[model samples]
Target: IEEGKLVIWINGDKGYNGLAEVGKKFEKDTGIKVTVEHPDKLEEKFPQVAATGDGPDIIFWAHDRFGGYAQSGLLAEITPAAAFQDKLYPFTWDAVRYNGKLIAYPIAVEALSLIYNKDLLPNPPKTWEEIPALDKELKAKGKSALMFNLQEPYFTWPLIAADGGYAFKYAAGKYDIKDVGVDNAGAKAGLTFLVDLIKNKHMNADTDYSIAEAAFNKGETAMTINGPWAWSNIDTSAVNYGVTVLPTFKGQPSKPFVGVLSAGINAASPNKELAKEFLENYLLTDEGLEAVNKDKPLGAVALKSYEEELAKDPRIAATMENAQKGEIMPNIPQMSAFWYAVRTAVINAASGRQTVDAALAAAQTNAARAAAQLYDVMDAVPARRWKEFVRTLGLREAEIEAVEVEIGRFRDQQYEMLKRWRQQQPAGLGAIYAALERMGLEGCAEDLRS
Candidate 1:
């Protein structure tokens, strides 16, 4: 009812569409009105606005992007309820903390694992080592052996993590630069195993989810690395799809980045009490869990009381086995640069430009540079130019499908607008950005713009 009242952002329509009813219930439940701002054109306007300290109060965001925001001190810093933090898995809570204070309260997280057309393979590969041979046999039959967006940073880390390597260390209840062990012997060995998948033509990094799914459905690709959220988007009529836990390295199990989209109180917000109260009620409520489930068949970060019963739902259980493998994504701002560097280097490596060791080392070096650049000024974003990846641009199922028709349409569209000066690159990341802004993930966007 007041001017500049409570506002939160999520990336896009999925947020609006999926959570609209729950959000409305929240407003009806509480007297305070929240403006669920939808800007089809906000990817540009938001960063400029937030950077100037004039953005929405909170944002709903992915765990990876929070790193840059936390690094830059642009996000409101506060801890989640102690009981709330303690109830969750260690990684889930750890991912949301920054310095000594928690930057954002986590809502949910996801990770990569093996999914197969049960009808085709009958049995998925027993190990990561088996994936290549399984895929090659299928490819020889005019089908791809597997499909994964190996070119994207977000999906590439499992290979490294499987070997017990990590992007950051957690030695004294805090994250520090000293933890980067991407070049560890185990990590290097793990990366080589991953790169061989591409080099052997088991998967084409250029192909995205939908393309791979289509191939698999057509019996062209037998199996692939995938997660729960993307499972629902497919046309499963031709075959039955089954999910198995992702494979770890030969001797060690892998840890794909799991994360939460949590609530945060703006240190700058005049409505801190109200926002925190809203978070207390909404993010921790049945409504919040329902919203997350509807958005993607993801397990709730908060794990509401009902989720235990809901978890038994056959469809949910089918995926939960694999979901349990997800590692809490790092909330540290350095994680952002860490992943970006990993992505660029791996894509190049996959395409045969360099060896796995060379590529990942390059990625680690780039990540270090990015961290230094991002943290050069406390609480302020660095002004260096940033590269955009396919995932960075907000590719949905529809967008994923469109990529086959035109590769850059999904990945490079923003740059097209940026070069034309019609929109700023790296600011507003499209539909997802809009929803996150409304859900207190504005800190999620602080990484991009100066």
Candidate 2:
């Protein structure tokens, strides 16, 4: 472990890129010669690059990527250091700790909070259950309730979480995975409610984020579900927008998939120690914070950033709080397929192709299938996360396990079924999915199967 030239790779996500912006100041302050590279190969490319040892000195990737990477031996273990660990927020450090190995150093922080126009959505409801009625109230007099992007299921992920369902439940601790709950009644109710919104005509296609953001900027749509990243494009004057967590189904706030932008060493590099030191300097310093904040509104990765003052910004604090309870996106190599399968199913279900039960079952099956493939590739894979390994389909092997497993599979399967169903008549599926697609999922459709 010796100091030398350093380089880092980045992907276009708020967590990673924002961390890079902050790290720039660290380079200036410490003269680490750190090079930051943004990977456009898509989130799909990280595995190929890292597995080949062609990855950079450090990676600013999602926490989900960490799980798969650690399982694949593509990431390095963090050295023991209480000083470095103590200063960080609880979950921030927790995100990188995989099966006792510290794989990364936390940097940029974020959360998905409610984004709405102050004028249009003057009186925001506390929970999603009330949204439809609110929308109806507006529509009766000719007004739009809220906006979402439906092309990608990512938009509605919060609702699923709020309903007490999870894409993939983690083991009791780090690195362990079990209980991928998608079809849980809570989640079904959450997603079903989304369909109800559209079926009831509470949302309109024109109320989507693309138009909403522009409209909110000029006083159009009342509310939206998004994070602060939208600031790069929208006018801040959008009717004095307010920020908060998306209303929960049972008054329970959905714990989002927390993303971590951390610095790490390239084990293959001769300068592994130098790289680690560079990461340390970049992660914990004032100049670093200033550099990160330079990214438009502000990027806070340090303890100071989490302060009450910082959180009071109304917009920044609303979403940032959700980071504390975030379940890091698994960085494990197989996570790509898991996310893809689940998101696809979610998008489909939101659009109305399959029934809720079908989407969950299929998604679970697909995620389990991907996990099985990953287990085969990585000898060190965790069996707990391998949903296929669950002793399911049993008559006497504990009814709970069998029932839960079936439920998992049911939801995944239904997600796609719902998408196809909705697509059959996109006009009828409602506006919630449209709101989600507008958020960033792109081509999210109700009748994708058609």
Candidate 3:
């Protein structure tokens, strides 16, 4: 145990490179080995691996997942000393808190902002009303005025939230789950403007994350709303991209949701003490945070001293300013269902498959169903977050039943089924196999099946 390896599962490889450098230093100073792994879809896979007792000693991820994991008893709680507490911005503290207890350490802060190409318009518009003029100039050059992942609810939330839209209503200093507001007048207006933009050829519903980012990077789009993550991919020399706060709509500012990238100890880790020490002694300090920012700078550090230290870098400072304009992401388990609700709304509305009103109506119903389903399942079996996990597959109820039956059977006879197939699950868990074949969810189904 004196010379044990503390494995840390990070969210992405780029960040892992910087963290791995810190691990090298940890080994040098403490004589304990620290290893970092950036698994694909770590967010989706962490719960499964950790619950099964084959997970990492520490995890580096977004604060949004903190509440769900803490509630599931998958995260170790950390009581932050006043000195430790004073390090982060007050806004980020809530993101790592669950049941009023601190559960993770905040590191990088982020919020989406309007990134515009300087050469395209010379002056960025302050209002959505002004976008049409910019659109005219860009289209004459065979380019777009603005672009983002219209199908992504996370990206679409800001436009709706700019007015008085919210997933859950805030009342008496707590989130009122019953007060869902995805189809409010403000939300409808925001969505309407977007639909008009797509219909008028100012934006494209088919353009997703890759296409949007690529369009901006190649100077094919004049403006795009995104966060710091998009900075690394762009060729700044050609694009001359500049970040600014989101534009206003009908006098209301478009504010994106703020999220914190965080670090936390695994509840099941045999080496919890060392994991905590690794975060505090090495990662949270000035030197450690510096090592992380070497390759790519984080938006803002939670620690006050670290915040002061990071302010010297304007790239970090600008993003922090944008974050200030945004609403802090709600770190509640109920927030999980909000994503599913909006996903349906945005895809249908943006793609011309459904009218804005129809899409929003569908989104509201879907959200309510998901919320009820989540409550029923989680209340009955406290550990599972099946609804959210299944929603990630982008499937319907019938298809999910197929995957569930197969999973249930595999659970009953894991060894026997493995002995027969050696790799795949039993023939068909239930009748969902043929249904999957008929539906377009084959890729996600096959991914789950294999």
Candidate 4:
């Protein structure tokens, strides 16, 4: 592809403006005009626009969405040279990979940790058992020892996953979507710990992200579960705060979800090589990272060389340390189902609306049902409707016959049939969805869309 100019899309004002300085340097060095556009809802907008081969050359977003984009053939496969790969935090690479192919360039890493006020609690608790004593001491002073967004699945995940709870079982470099662990014995133990904390009044069931954040910033709570992004909103001088890895739970270290922010090349761009050069030579380099960080500090720089300097700040040091011990948030599309189910479980158990066992049991069932629907949509179409559905895709009779034969061979295997259809059809899942909609199966189509 010819390379004269490059266009990039970033969502936030800080990151969008921060990259402008870097873009200027790149333009000066290479004589390639660089355009950085800050678009609202870039995450949702990128997929729709890129589908038609008319979007930015690069997109700045979180790593979790790469899986869906890559699956849809929207992101170019990126295999960074070994030398370039060596400079990044090893774990950061994991977030950018889909089916053994690197799909994005990881820029920064983040994870929830113990953010506490040093003035209120000189020494942070080393274990959950230690929290009760601190709670007792704080209660005497009309304060609370700990306060986090109790109803948020992201914040509560550490407690739920600390004891071997997992949304999906991973093996052989893939997730077994059928095997959910949310209601397992280990998960029960974990949720029980969270429920006890709420019952004991160490944290409020009604506390949400904003409420917890405000309480901690105002010094009303000694400690809260938060990530590096929250640092900008906090007043360090007033709170005298410090961050560290979460304390142990049931003799095991707390495991929060790790999130990686990344930059990806749009597969539809006409300037793929130029975009690659710009990312490799400017965005991922030591100087490039520093330039961006100066404008807006990336919580934890992914480049190992740059991280050495950023870690000088105690907060960054603790965030990097905790992130090292955290689990990467699952990037697969099925993760949406897990999130949908787990949120209800966390809210019910924390708010005393349901017992932990009942809430978790419900969550497991819901997640399983949701995941199954992803595969079962094709099977849901009755045999009598198959030809009508295929006809809606505008497939010729020969193509229709081929689809029927393939579907027959994969009968009773929903996921395999879906995969085979995608491989054979040019529009892939889009064709399937359109056909379903044309045939008045909007509910099934929407389920697949979700």
Candidate 5:
């Protein structure tokens, strides 16, 4: 531990005061100072700073980015005690895992759900098919029935994924990047459903988040597809609203993306053990979790005990039910391409710039091309030294086991292991060459350079 202090970096003020309260208790118990900082541009700066072995002991953020951090050798692998793990909602575990290893401890989870003004919509529609009649009734009153960020893939994914569409296939305990499904028949059908909604005047095609949110707040729209975080800004006095899982699309359940807020131990921190202890003993406990929730009322607390306690509130109960039905957002770096492609497709198709079929086809092509570029580096180390090379890259024992059993070919495994390193390392390929030279593999280094 450096100077008997543990430092934590988080992005915003959402959970800042709660964590600071926990820090006070922690210091009282352990004689270790706890510092919580809300840094600007944390997501962009964390990897760059952590690569130099100078980051905080812990970073509190959403689970999505930890996969990239772990792949870049920036996060310490964690195996929380089974007792503690058993206390959390099971799906939250899916959010924190990278390559079947737990890289963070989840605190809360959120997912998109239907938030409807109870005054206008006492009973929300149970299925998408039921919306048109309701829209006609609302249209007569000069109000729309529904509105949401039409061009944002995150907001629209429930519709697109309702019929079994997906960004990548998950099988054999890992995601298959080669299996791009956004342009599949099921996806096309889903997109068609969305386009038809716009064309039929059930929803506005020009709506973005702010527009949708403002309309909902002003009681101009009866319902919206939004997550728990949106409740804070909603004008409760102006619009009496209730939350519930989204309506079914063609009899299939809407599968929105579930996101988890988590805390990860920085691999480069000098206080790894202290950080682990603080997380397990202080942050993950009932007292700690409750403190944070008390401050911010995390709409969907991960701990079963805390969640059940909060479930007495109908809104929290509805959010949890929706999250249970939702898919955990994939944490792999390739998700960057998935987001980019889907956003482009949504924009083009919704704006009539391209047909749904053409837009989805372009998305598939662009996502595949972008994903392919992530693995364009060489892995010149021979099979005989594969284990040694991976060890140098800081592969923990369990991670090495995954490499040995699940990874099929030396080149394929090396690409998976080195892709993030190549992207994050300042020297890039030159760093790889130097590491090989230090390992007495001069020929291999030369081959890699060539």
Candidate 6:
């Protein structure tokens, strides 16, 4: 309370109506000031900034990144009161919690849904199998029945995962990353289905993210699978739109990965109590949530009371309905590797560059490739940047040779230090800078910071 000010950081497009309104309300309620900042590449910058104890009091971001930050000890453990915990959806609770402690407060849920123009198709297909029935109608109008970015893992995972395919299975009360499942039989079936759709001219394999959305908005495509993030690009008056759960695959529900947007406290922040009060009390309240959702709908809020209020809107109902059939994205470090591997597999198979089995096998191989490079990235990433700063300095040849030798010695020292850094934790920017200071390269830290 003595700090009297709170800083919150969020990542998104330029509009800040919801956040600005929320800040104004928080200030009036508790006589404390609040500042909202939008920094480019906040995810990349946050780890270093927070590590140096120079980050904002709070952060607003996707829940899947909670694992790396929590493991690094950059997130405060929020032991919400019983009343507070009861307000959130049960599935959402698992997302905000890390190890055994709560790491964030869920505000909005995102999942894929079949968004269609009502005028073009009064009733969309209830199951993907129904697409063939509408082909005559769709082709007659020179439009496609369905469209999405086939090369994107996030969009395609639902179709594959519906048949019991998964990146990793939840086992023994934790995510069993060792037993990867992307190459499983279920995934092959899903990829094969996608291949047939493209071959049959039911969809477009060439439709990337922007093209998929643009075609729908331009009336070239009747429907697309997208999330709330695409709401900003739509012209409601121009297109009568409706949202429904993704069509079924082989009698099973298409299970999209649900991503949650949550508010979390930075471990290094000094204004913990203020941040906690604002989030748990003010921001989660009826008036508070309404202000946050005023500009545009952000799915259902965590609180049942607020959700009941928002559910009256058809958009919110559709989001909640589809989210009910979705699985929360696993918040773990291995997910980083999974994204790259699966996306690569999607591209190869969808492009007809590989058969279904070959594509899945490639994903398995790619995941191992990523895992092998993980440690190199953690340690080697810093080493390369440090050497660049040394190169930029205009030192004499003799001095340069001497500095290179010293840098080599430091690199070897760091190889071991960074190994311990991962286990010793905090593993932050401070440790790297301290090593730089020891090497008598403190001035370079300032240059790199900019």
Off by over 4 Å in 2: 1-3, 11-32, 36-55, 174-178, 204-218, 236-239, 295-309, 371-450
Full-model lDDT for every candidate = 0.60, 0.59, 0.73, 0.81, 0.81, 0.75
lDDT of 1 by residue, 323-438 (tens): 45656666554565676677777777777788878887777677755433323222331122122222333434454344345545422533332232212233122333444355
- Model 6, 70-186: lDDT tens digits are 878888988888878888777888888777788888988878888998888998888877886686578888887877877678999889988878777776447876778878777
Q: Candidate 3: lDDT over CA atoms?
A: 0.73
Tens digit of per-residue lDDT, candidate 5, span 203-317: 7678999899999999999999998888888845467788987899889888898899989988888788888888888888778888877777677889888788888988888
Q: Is candidate 1 or candidate 5 better by lDDT?
A: 5
Candidate 1 ranges beyond 4 A from true positions? 1-5, 17-20, 27-29, 40-47, 51-53, 136-140, 198-201, 204-210, 235-237, 291-300, 313-326, 371-450
Which segments of candidate 6 are over 4 A away from where they belong? 12-17, 368-386, 389-450
**Residue 271 of candidate 6: its Cα lDDT?**
87
Cα-based TM-score, every candidate = 0.73, 0.71, 0.77, 0.82, 0.82, 0.83
- Model 3 residue runs over 4 Å out of place are 1-5, 27-31, 170-174, 308-314, 371-450
The backbone clash count of each candidate, in order, is: 40, 64, 4, 0, 0, 0
lDDT of 4 by residue, 218-283 (tens): 888899999887887786536778898798888888888999998999998878888999998888
lDDT tens digits by residue: candidate 2, 1-450: 224666777665534555666556556766766666776643344555555566677766656556656655667787747776666676777777777778877766676777776666666788888887787777766667777775455667777767677766666664334556776888787777776776677754234446656655665567777666776555446367777766767878766666666655555556677667766665565555544555443443536534444665666666666655445565554455566676667666656777777887787668655433223222221333223212211113344344555556643433333333333322211233233234443242223211
* CA RMSD per model (angstroms): 10.8, 12.4, 8.4, 6.4, 10.3, 6.1
Decide which is better by TM-score, 1 or 5: 5
Looking at candidate 5, what is the lDDT of residue 206? 82
lDDT order, best first, reads 5, 4, 6, 3, 1, 2
Alpha-carbon error at 290 in model 3, in Å?
0.6
Candidate 1, residue 287: how far the Cα is off, in Å = 4.2
